[PDB]
Design an enzyme around this catalytic site. Structure first.
Site, PDB file in Angstrom:
ATOM      1  N   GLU A 200      30.214  73.650  41.452  1.00  0.00           N
ATOM      2  CA  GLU A 200      29.672  74.791  40.716  1.00  0.00           C
ATOM      3  C   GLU A 200      30.493  76.091  40.877  1.00  0.00           C
ATOM      4  OE1 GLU A 200      27.962  72.602  42.399  1.00  0.00           O
ATOM      5  OE2 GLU A 200      26.943  71.579  40.703  1.00  0.00           O
TER       6      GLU A 200
ATOM      7  N   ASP B  14      32.330  66.427  44.526  1.00  0.00           N
ATOM      8  CA  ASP B  14      30.988  66.999  44.555  1.00  0.00           C
ATOM      9  C   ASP B  14      31.049  68.514  44.741  1.00  0.00           C
ATOM     10  OD1 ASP B  14      28.254  67.265  44.611  1.00  0.00           O
ATOM     11  OD2 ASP B  14      27.906  65.986  46.369  1.00  0.00           O
TER      12      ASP B  14
ATOM     13  N   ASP C 209      21.589  66.581  41.474  1.00  0.00           N
ATOM     14  CA  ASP C 209      20.396  66.261  42.254  1.00  0.00           C
ATOM     15  C   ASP C 209      19.109  66.462  41.444  1.00  0.00           C
ATOM     16  OD1 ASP C 209      22.373  65.941  44.234  1.00  0.00           O
ATOM     17  OD2 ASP C 209      22.029  67.927  45.072  1.00  0.00           O
TER      18      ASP C 209
END
Ligand SMILES: [Cl-]
Ligand SMILES: [Cl-]
Ligand SMILES: [Cl-]
Ligand SMILES: [Cl-]
Ligand code: NI
Ligand code: NI
Length: 944
Positions: free
Chosen positions: A540, A537, A614
């Site tokens: 970015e 996770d 998300d």
């Protein structure tokens, strides 16, 4: 004054006499791939080792170099590049003499602006232009959230976000695509960054006074009314502190969620043409234009995004603007771009923020598949995922204990609802040790046992691991001492969201030496317990949520490859690459799996899937995931997924009169209907994307928590889960195809119907493999939807068997229980028995279903599903070929063999020719049975 030509072994290097571009290199990468590098200098060595490309110039590819007058031709058997010796412009024609791609100029170099850090003397803002006045369709580019499939005539920002993933691979309606090999933020269409509203528009307030009128409310009460040019609360500067703070009067209402706002005024464009508008927001926002709604959006306060639309405006006109933003703690900013120059309106433009050169790869291909294959060739084969990864995944944010995970997995099994994988999200460690990779002893006393109990139920388990480390931890300390921690987050004193808030930092993955420690930490602490997969996770990266993108750039400076900006899109690749590599090192015969929340060119070479992150339990968002998946697949990255039901639902769904809503039973009466219909339609959509996966924040997302046993919606959900497994022979064939045939699972209609223009633009249908036309229902309470049947094929209603012709747009029956599905006439669809998890169906009996009315071809791919033996040729194909004129299905000689493959197979064949009540009754359908032994056998279709 013509260019000097140097004949290299990989092509040519032209030395241009005048202009900013001094050297132009062509490199033959393969039979269908030529690299193009325009350099404002003399040292190609200044250009960085690709993060995306692993492919070197070809040695075994014949090519010719002819030169005469003002043109210089370089050609292969499949591609020819014609360069002008005058300015340096390249022109690509196919092997049969047609213009595919014309360069306009030689590029536009200029100073780097959007980099907060000191810039290299030889770095510049890049921009290349192509094909002015083109009628081209454009596809791919990655996962985006504004509903675009055909990008022609519009802008894409290829940045990196929670919700956005750039893959700079562009596919054309024509027979070609290109890879834009830049690691920095890149822009398709308009080169510029969408400016504030007020930069290319004049603003009038409520009366008409030449900025907007901004009214501030606390509840329903009016508390202030001033006027501002740029209403801007887009970012935090620091921690939870807005960049621009809210007025003294209502600074309090923002924190307590009673603050609400309205904007009112008028906008007058000053240029004539198409304008872009972007509403960046959290909370509830509705923009209204000309007494009519244009945008209605909502997002959790801490993961806003842009919502866009294009209007055709006239230079003198004024139109009325009304916005309503109930921030509920989040952010807001309106952006805008005015029409580009006239000649640039209909053209192809690519620009990056920083780079040393214009570097890209032209990829030619007779079909879209052929073009993805050129992408795969440059950036690496999409390695096999384990077979179980295409099974159903059940996740939650979050399971709180070993006990809970095993309890929920047991519930599926008990309810005979198929499932392969369950996931453990964040926060299994001691609260004050993120990055230690330890397991809190209160909730997770024995990880090995937890994995052992999961495995004993024939399931796999995946676990969250971030690139995030607390400076208190030994693991941080180890990384930090080699210089591999991004420490500016610490100087800035940014606390995360756990408890009182902890100091925290992200590692630097741009060094292999760094990622080798990273992997060894998680190897030492997690892999020994035997987890099956890594949920990587936050890649970015999202070091601190909601800072400006410049600040986000600043935070990864210095990294091994230079500035934060020079690699803003590429973090996920070196990172996942490190995990993939360590796995290979440890177990050289099992398939790793990674799910990761960001990508770039080449991510598929790390055995990783991506998901859109998300997103919010909203219809607008479910619709938009269609184009998100489409663009990701047409970018060359097929193993993609999202959160069924969305990551974060509104508050009406999480909290109620009954407290914390876990099960649907704790919802407010009036809310139940929509929550159940949203999940029903989303589960339907989910079973027809590359990975099938339920995850999110509360409410809980297991099928049995969304509705009760026996109800329509429970039954509809169980059904599609069951269908997914019935279809596993078909699906896992796609799975193998991704690797062995450089295949693409989620297919935009242009891949399979490229001569159909109407199909190009469609953003709510797609091909799921070769057979299925998927049409998700994205509107609350809708019980039908328009569905375009592409021309040139007939189609079967998958459920009823009714046969329609293509070329038309029908109103397709879409009751709550069913998503409109149609099979392409000529499809051969294999199904297996009902299984509860993928291995159960190994060597399984097959139903072969032939959809008559056209010829057909499908080779069933089979292997052990878990091992690397497929790489030494341990796999099989069972070729299926169907001739509609003779009505005969040939099940050809089995090709290949793998360890634990059965020689004999019970296979039964049936033919659908129109309506049949048994259209999906796989077990009981009338079928002719065959005892297949690897030898070719033929089955004639029934008479009349
Ligand atoms: Cl079993
Ligand atoms: Cl079982
Ligand atoms: Cl079982
Ligand atoms: Cl079993
Ligand atoms: Ni085990
Ligand atoms: Ni089983």
């Amino acid at each position: 004054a013509l260019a000097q030509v140097e004949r290299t072994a990989e092509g040519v290097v032209l030395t241009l006499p005048e202009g900013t571009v001094k050297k132009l290199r062509l490199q033959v990468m393969g039979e269908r791939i030529i690299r193009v590098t325009a350099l404002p200098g003399t040292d190609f060595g200044i250009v960085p080792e690709s993060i995306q490309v692993v492919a070197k110039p070809a040695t075994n590819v014949p090519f010719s170099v002819d030169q005469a007058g003002e043109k210089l031709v370089l050609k292969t058997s499949q591609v020819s590049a014609e360069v002008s010796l005058l300015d340096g412009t390249v022109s690509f024609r196919d092997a049969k003499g047609n213009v595919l791609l014309q360069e306009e100029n030689r590029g536009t170099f200029s100073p780097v602006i959007h980099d907060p850090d000191p810039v290299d003397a030889d770095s510049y803002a890049l921009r290349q232009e192509f094909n002015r006045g083109s009628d081209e369709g454009f596809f791919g580019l990655g996962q985006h959230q504004n509903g675009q499939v055909n990008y022609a005539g519009e802008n894409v920002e290829l940045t990196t976000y929670n919700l956005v993933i750039s893959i700079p691979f562009l596919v054309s309606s024509r027979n070609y695509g290109l890879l834009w090999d830049n690691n920095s933020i890149t822009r398709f269409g308009d080169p510029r960054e969408a400016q504030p509203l007020n930069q290319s528009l004049k603003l009038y307030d409520a009366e008409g006074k030449e900025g907007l009128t901004v009214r501030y409310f606390v509840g329903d009460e009016l508390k202030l009314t001033r006027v501002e040019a740029d209403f801007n609360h887009q970012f935090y500067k620091q921690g939870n502190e807005l960049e621009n703070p809210f007025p003294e009067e209502v600074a309090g209402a923002y924190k307590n969620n009673t603050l609400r706002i309205e904007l009112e005024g008028s906008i007058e464009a000053q240029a004539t043409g198409k304008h872009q508008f972007k509403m960046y927001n959290s909370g509830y926002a509705q923009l209204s234009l000309d007494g009519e709604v244009v945008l209605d959006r909502w997002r959790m306060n801490w993961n806003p995004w842009y919502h866009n639309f294009y209007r055709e405006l006239n230079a003198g006109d004024k139109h009325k603007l009304k916005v309503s933003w109930k921030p509920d703690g989040g952010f807001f900013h309106l952006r805008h771009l005015d029409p580009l120059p006239a000649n640039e309106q209909h053209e192809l433009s690519l620009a990056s923020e920083t780079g040393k050169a214009i570097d890209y790869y032209f990829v030619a291909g007779d079909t879209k598949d052929d073009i993805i294959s050129g992408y795969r060739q440059l950036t690496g084969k999409s390695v096999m995922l384990p077979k179980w990864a295409y099974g159903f995944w059940q996740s939650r944010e979050r399971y709180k204990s070993s006990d809970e995970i095993i309890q929920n997995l047991k519930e599926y099994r008990d309810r005979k609802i198929p499932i392969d994988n369950i996931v453990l999200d964040w926060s299994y460690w001691p609260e004050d040790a993120w990055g230690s990779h330890d397991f809190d002893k209160q909730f997770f006393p024995d990880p090995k046992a937890l994995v052992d109990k999961v495995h004993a139920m024939n399931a796999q388990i995946m676990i969250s691991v971030w690139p995030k480390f607390y400076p208190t931890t030994d693991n941080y300390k180890e990384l930090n001492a080699k210089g591999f921690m991004f420490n500016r987050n610490l100087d800035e004193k940014n606390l995360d969201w756990i408890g009182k808030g902890y100091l925290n930092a992200f590692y630097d993955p741009f060094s292999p030496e760094a990622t080798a420690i990273f992997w060894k930490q998680i190897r030492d602490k997690i892999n020994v317990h035997g987890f099956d997969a890594w949920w990587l996770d936050a890649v970015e990266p999202d070091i601190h949520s909601n800072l400006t993108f410049e600040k986000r750039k600043w935070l990864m400076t210095p990294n091994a490859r230079g500035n934060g900006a020079e690699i803003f899109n590429a973090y996920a690749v070196p990172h996942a690459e490190g995990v993939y590599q360590g796995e290979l090192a440890t177990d050289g015969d099992k398939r790793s799996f990674i799910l990761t929340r960001s990508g770039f060119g080449g991510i598929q070479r790390t055995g990783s899937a991506i998901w859109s992150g998300d997103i919010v339990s909203r219809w607008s968002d479910m619709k938009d995931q269609i184009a998100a998946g489409i663009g990701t697949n047409l970018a060359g990255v097929t193993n993609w997924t999202f959160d069924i039901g969305g990551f974060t639902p509104e508050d009406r769904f999480r909290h109620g009169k009954k407290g914390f809503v876990g099960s649907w039973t704790a919802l407010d009466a009036e809310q139940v209907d929509e929550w159940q219909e949203l999940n029903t339609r989303w589960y339907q959509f989910g079973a027809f994307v590359p990975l099938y996966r339920s995850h999110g924040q509360n409410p809980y997302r297991e099928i049995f928590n969304i509705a009760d046993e026996g109800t329509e919606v429970y039954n509809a959900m169980v059904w599609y889960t069951k269908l997914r497994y019935y279809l596993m022979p078909y699906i896992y064939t796609l799975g193998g195809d991704t690797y062995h045939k450089d295949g693409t699972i989620m297919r935009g209609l242009v891949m399979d119907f490229p001569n159909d223009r109407k199909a190009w633009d469609i953003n709510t249908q797609y091909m799921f493999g070769p057979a299925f036309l998927v049409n998700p229902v994205y509107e609350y309470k809708a019980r039908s939807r328009d569905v375009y049947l592409p021309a040139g094929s007939d189609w079967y209603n998958f459920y009823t068997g009714e046969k329609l012709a293509g070329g038309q747009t029908i109103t397709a029956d879409a009751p709550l229980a069913r998503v409109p599905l149609f099979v392409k006439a000529g499809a051969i669809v294999p199904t297996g028995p009902l299984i509860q998890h993928v291995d159960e169906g190994l060597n399984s009996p097959l139903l072969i279903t032939v959809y008559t009315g056209a010829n057909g071809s499908f080779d069933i791919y089979e292997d052990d599903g878990r091992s690397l033996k497929y790489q030494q040729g341990e796999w099989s194909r069972i070729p299926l070929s169907y001739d509609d004129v003779t009505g005969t299905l040939i099940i050809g000689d089995r090709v290949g063999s793998f360890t634990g493959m059965a020689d004999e197979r019970n296979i039964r064949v049936r033919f659908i020719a129109g309506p049949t009540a048994d259209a999906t009754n796989f077990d009981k359908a009338a079928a002719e049975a065959v005892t297949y032994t690897g030898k070719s056998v033929s089955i004639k279709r029934p008479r009349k």
